[PDB]
């Protein structure tokens, strides 16, 4: 019920921010290939 | 460019399609996804405190606290937009989504940020809020972007979120709407974007009627077809119309 889903929400959030860090760094490197 | 329509927690179909998208986009795709999914010692990201205006703050500090909050949530580079925004939905319902974003506390893109910015500035009548939408062209394709224009104490600025630092927040130092727009135009050209269309909405009411939506395109300008002088002329006339409540 409303408890297993909170655990899942938090798990998904931690993976989302780990993913977003990696993708942010990739965009920063492709964008740097543009400015160079 | 997917959008999560399953709420929270994100359902299976939405979750797996996000992961396949990033696996494809990233050069080390499959190795990357395996390092994150079901990783056992992932940091639990802290939850930023939601800004709230206090009489002890200046208005620029308060609005910078709003912009820093959005930067802390981060621009969403995953390819999956996490909060569905239906643009013609009444403000009443959009404000429930904005509240939801402060609760779930996830990365956001440009439209989500405009809604957040409205939510976080509602209740301070000295700030007027209105959306500014851009349609641009870059190497064969059209791109869309929106920010929250603001007007306060005789100055224009903005709040927003973008993959670029120059296509978002602008301080309260522009003396005309035209100067604000032309600053966005000049920033866009650093990235070899041509602005095709500028759309200005109406002021977003602090106390909307139950059914009132945001109006996104009260003024629509096909800017790539016009000269500087004609663009400024039209923007200044519309801006004075706004400030008069005509």
Swiss-Prot record, chain A:
Q: Which keywords does this Swiss-Prot/TrEMBL entry list?
A: Coiled coil, Cytoplasm, Cytoskeleton, Disease variant, Intellectual disability, Secreted
Q: Name one GO molecular function term.
A: microtubule binding
Coiled-coil annotated spans: 1-29
* Protein location: Cytoplasm; Secreted; Cytoplasm, Cytoskeleton
Disulfide bond keyword on record: no
Effect caused by changing residue 19 to E: No effect on VASH1 tyrosine carboxypeptidase activity on alpha-tubulin
Q: Please, which domain of life does this record's source organism belong to?
A: Eukaryota
GO CC, alphabetical: apical part of cell; cytoplasm; cytoskeleton; extracellular region
Consequence when changing residue 11 to E: No effect on VASH1 tyrosine carboxypeptidase activity on alpha-tubulin
Per the record, the major location class is: cytoplasm
Residue span of the signal peptide, if any?
none
Q: Which GO BP terms sit in this record?
A: axon development; negative regulation of endothelial cell migration; negative regulation of protein ubiquitination; protein secretion; proteolysis; regulation of metallopeptidase activity
Changing residue 9 to E: reported impact? Answer: Decreased VASH1 tyrosine carboxypeptidase activity on alpha-tubulin
Q: Please describe, based on the UniProt annotation, the reported consequence of changing residue 16 to E.
A: No effect on VASH1 tyrosine carboxypeptidase activity on alpha-tubulin
According to the record's subunit comment, the protein's assembly and interactions are: Interacts with VASH1 and VASH2.
Clinical note on disease: Neurodevelopmental disorder with ataxia, hypotonia, and microcephaly: An autosomal recessive neurodevelopmental disorder characterized by intellectual disability, microcephaly, ataxia, and muscular hypotonia.
Question: According to its UniProt record, which protein family does this protein belong to?
Answer: Belongs to the SVBP family.
**Function field:** Enhances the tyrosine carboxypeptidase activity of VASH1 and VASH2, thereby promoting the removal of the C-terminal tyrosine residue of alpha-tubulin. This activity is critical for spindle function and accurate chromosome segregation during mitosis since microtubule detyronisation regulates mitotic spindle length and postioning. Also required to enhance the solubility and secretion of VASH1 and VASH2. Plays a role in axon and excitatory synapse formation.
Q: What is this protein called?
A: Small vasohibin-binding protein
Q: Which organism is it from?
A: Homo sapiens (Human)
Q: Which residues of the full protein are shown?
A: 24 to 59 of 66
From Swiss-Prot, chain B:
At the top level of its lineage, which domain of life is listed?
A: Eukaryota
Keyword Secreted on entry: yes
Q: What is its main location?
A: cytoplasm
Q: What is its EC number?
A: 3.4.17.17
Query: Which transformation does this protein catalyse, written as a reaction?
Result: C-terminal L-alpha-aminoacyl-L-glutamyl-L-glutamyl-L-tyrosyl-[tubulin] + H2O = C-terminal L-alpha-aminoacyl-L-glutamyl-L-glutamyl-[tubulin] + L-tyrosine
Provide the induction entry. By VEGF.
Signal sequence coordinates:
none
A GO molecular function assigned to this protein is: actin binding
Stretches that traverse the bilayer: none
Q: Which GO terms describe its biological process?
A: axon development; cell-cell fusion; labyrinthine layer blood vessel development; positive regulation of angiogenesis; positive regulation of endothelial cell proliferation; proteolysis; regulation of angiogenesis; syncytium formation by plasma membrane fusion
Outcome reported for the amino acid change (mutating residue 144 to A): No effect on tyrosine carboxypeptidase activity
Location comes to: Cytoplasm; Secreted; Cytoplasm, Cytoskeleton
Q: What is its EC class?
A: hydrolase
Q: What is the effect of changing residue 86 to A?
A: Slightly reduced tyrosine carboxypeptidase activity
Entry keyword annotation includes Phosphoprotein: yes
Q: Which residues form the active site?
A: 110, 145, 162
Outcome, altering residue 162 to A = Reduced tyrosine carboxypeptidase activity
Q: Which UniProt keywords apply?
A: Carboxypeptidase, Cytoplasm, Cytoskeleton, Hydrolase, Phosphoprotein, Protease, Secreted
* Annotated GO CC locations: cytoplasm; cytoskeleton; cytosol; extracellular region
**Family affiliation:** Belongs to the transglutaminase-like superfamily. Vasohibin family.
Subunit info?
Interacts with SVBP; interaction enhances VASH2 tyrosine carboxypeptidase activity.
- In UniProt terms, what function does this protein have? Tyrosine carboxypeptidase that removes the C-terminal tyrosine residue of alpha-tubulin, thereby regulating microtubule dynamics and function. Critical for spindle function and accurate chromosome segregation during mitosis since microtubule detyronisation regulates mitotic spindle length and postioning. Acts as an activator of angiogenesis: expressed in infiltrating mononuclear cells in the sprouting front to promote angiogenesis. Plays a role in axon formation.
The protein's name in its UniProt record: Tubulinyl-Tyr carboxypeptidase 2
- Organism whose genome encodes this protein: Homo sapiens (Human)
Q: What is the lineage of its organism?
A: Eukaryota, Metazoa, Chordata, Craniata, Vertebrata
Question: What gene is this protein translated from?
Answer: VASH2
């Amino acid at each position: 019920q409303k408890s297993a889903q909170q655990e899942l929400k938090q798990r998904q959030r931690a993976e989302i921010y780990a993913l977003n860090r990696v993708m942010t760094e990739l965009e920063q490197q492709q964008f740097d290939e543009f400015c160079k | 460019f997917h959008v999560n329509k399953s709420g929270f927690p994100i359902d299976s179909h939405t979750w797996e399609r996000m992961w396949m998208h990033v696996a494809k986009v990233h050069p080390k795709g499959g190795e990357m996804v395996g390092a994150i999914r079901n990783a056992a010692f992932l940091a639990k990201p802290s939850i930023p405190q939601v800004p709230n205006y206090r009489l002890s703050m200046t208005i620029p500090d308060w609005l910078q606290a709003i912009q820093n909050y959005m930067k802390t949530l981060q621009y969403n580079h995953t390819g999956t937009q996490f909060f569905e925004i239906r643009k013609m939905r009444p403000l009443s319902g959009l404000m429930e989504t904005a509240k939801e974003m402060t609760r779930e506390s996830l990365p956001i893109k440009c439209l989500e940020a405009v809604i957040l910015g409205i939510y976080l500035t509602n209740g301070q009548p000295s700030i007027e809020r209105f959306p500014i939408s851009f349609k641009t062209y870059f190497s064969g394709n059209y791109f869309h972007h929106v920010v929250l224009g603001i007007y306060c104490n005789g100055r224009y600025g903005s709040l927003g979120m973008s993959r670029r630092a120059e296509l978002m927040d602008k301080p309260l130092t522009f003396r005309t709407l035209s100067d604000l727009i032309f600053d966005f135009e000049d920033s866009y050209k650093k990235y070899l974007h041509t602005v095709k269309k500028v759309k200005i909405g109406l002021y977003v009411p602090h106390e909307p009627h139950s059914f009132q939506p945001i109006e996104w395109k009260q003024l629509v300008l096909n800017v790539s077809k016009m000269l500087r002088a004609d663009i400024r002329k039209e923007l200044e006339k519309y801006a004075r119309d706004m400030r008069m409540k005509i």
